[PDB]
Write a protein that binds this ligand. Structure first.
Ligand code: NAI
Ligand code: NAI
Lengths: 299, 279
């Protein structure tokens, strides 16, 4: 009957919740005391990733019935604690897929042509044409690991650049991926073929360190790698070693095993381009997720 | 019988053929070397000047013609690389990747600052629908951008075949979320984007120039950026190269490269081979 919105959400979320007949209260960046106190009269909580929904937070809100996440995953929500109290947890798995796919494509282009580094050079007063000789994407092979919502959207865009798109996904059949132009091969056959590799899987035991010292050793010398999925899918130590040896020519990272990352070695590397987890950070994605979660609450 | 190579060319160019111009019948350049009237006249034996690239703006065509010197180029050799950089600038403007990288490298984690724009459903205006313009169009169409444009010699039927609706310029400006230019530099295209045309644009338009410096009036661009009329610009090219005025490059909403549009191993290989073969 009453819902708190604790993070930075599009105005449409509050609006929809009230059309359904609910009261709202949208205080951002609250403290553990100033949140749980504002959770006392609310049956619903809505967050992005800023508000941390620990067991201690969940247990304190006696009236809490539902936690809604405006995004994919449940990383900032204790799914175990919630279930132990009969609290429903909902998210918005489709709301920001396009924005993540678009950012991934931008990362690929930035790696091919070193645009972030070139801008940095220009702003440092330099004119360094030879240093930034880049790579044409036409005819190059892009490997896509994870062919769900985002992987297939990345594929069709990079196909317009004349990239060959190959990939792997344990639940997508070769016939199905072919229908959006991705040729599936066993992982072992993928590494030596790729000029670029991008990952679009959840973080699981099978995907933690999907790229590691061993798979980097099976890659083309000079492969470039993108992670706009979850930190840890690409083993960060292995990536660094590959960058340092030159086996990896560059990497683009939107996500990290720790956010913000305390370890600065990858971010500081001259061949690494990075963003502070911006994959879902468009006005449009935020509008869509804001609505998607409100709709789920109204029901 | 003898050929000089004066700029930075792929190794294949010298191999294939098999001041310091006094004994040469052939000269090969990119855009760095200025082949002015004064230069052509000194080289009595010069028969052909080959440009490993698209423009011949750096070659005095009048001087060459007055001495019977053939001037050749490689008009298709680096078109793809230019179109690919243009698309990358477009993505960079929408999501501010270069700025976010700079931020991260300063130890910052600035999520709110770099809230961006989704390309899907946005309108891209493409001025110049020749070799590069049409390649930018089909790529950005895969992102779900509406592509409109203008070109005085390209028919509506031809642009329709690569999905670009042509309109008069005056109708283009208010429609565009992004504008990219792919024309030569001519009096008619100098300041194609200027104060008068920025005034007709959507507030917050984003602009790309990977063509020639001056097509976007740099003084006008800075004013549009200062007001917010232009939300961002990506520049590969400048009216002076390297530019001595740093105001645009130094602007936080400006992304830039030192004229890298043709600077891929593949483009240079193609232009290098193509011009050598012609010799
Ligand atoms: N950087 C950001 O801001 C954003 C990150 N994401 C994340 O991107 C990733 C992909 O998201 P979606 O495509 O919507 O998820 P999805 O669930 O639609 O697709 C994920 C695919 O990964 C497959 N997969 C699982 N294990 C695999 C393995 N060992 N190898 C290859 N594929 C495997 C799954 O079968 C599934 O098809 C997720 O981690 C998501 O949380 C999503 C949106 C924004
Ligand atoms: N940034 C870089 O390193 C590179 C820059 N370029 C430059 O890109 C530009 C386009 O190259 P291409 O597409 O291969 O040339 P193109 O000759 O194939 O097409 C140029 C088009 O611009 C049209 N045009 C002329 N005036 C116009 C006007 N007022 N408004 C609209 N259209 C007009 C022409 O009708 C022509 O169709 C040239 O300036 C070229 O020198 C080319 C390759 C890489």
């Amino acid at each position: 009957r009453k819902v708190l919105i604790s993070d930075s959400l599009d105005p449409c979320c509050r609006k929809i919740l009230q059309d359904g007949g609910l009261q709202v209260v949208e205080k951002q960046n609250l403290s553990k005391e100033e949140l749980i106190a504002e959770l006392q009269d609310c049956e619903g909580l809505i967050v992005r990733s800023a508000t941390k929904v620990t067991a201690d937070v969940i247990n304190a809100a006696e009236k809490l019935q539902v936690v809604g996440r405006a995004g994919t995953g449940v990383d900032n929500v204790d799914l175990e604690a919630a279930t132990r109290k009969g609290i429903l947890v909902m998210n918005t798995p489709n709301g920001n897929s396009l924005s993540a796919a678009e950012l991934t494509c931008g990362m690929i282009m930035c790696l091919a042509r070193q645009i972030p580094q070139a801008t940095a050079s220009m702003k440092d007063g330099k004119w360094e044409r030879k240093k930034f000789m880049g790579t044409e994407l036409n005819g190059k092979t892009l490997g896509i690991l994870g062919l769900g919502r985002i992987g297939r959207e990345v594929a069709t865009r990079m196909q317009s650049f004349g990239m060959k798109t190959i990939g792997y996904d344990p639940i997508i059949s070769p016939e199905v991926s072919a229908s959006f132009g991705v040729q599936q091969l066993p992982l072992e056959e993928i590494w030596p073929l790729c000029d670029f590799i991008t990952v679009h899987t959840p973080l699981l035991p099978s995907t933690t360190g999907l790229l590691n010292d061993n798979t980097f050793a099976q890659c083309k010398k000079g492969v470039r790698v993108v992670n706009c999925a979850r930190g840890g899918i690409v083993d960060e130590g292995a990536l660094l070693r590959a960058l340092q040896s030159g086996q990896c020519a560059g990497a683009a990272l939107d996500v990290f095993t720790e956010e913000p990352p305390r370890d600065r070695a990858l971010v500081d590397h001259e061949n690494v381009i990075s963003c502070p987890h911006l994959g879902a950070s468009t006005k449009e994605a935020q509008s869509r997720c804001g609505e998607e979660i409100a709709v789920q609450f109204v029901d």
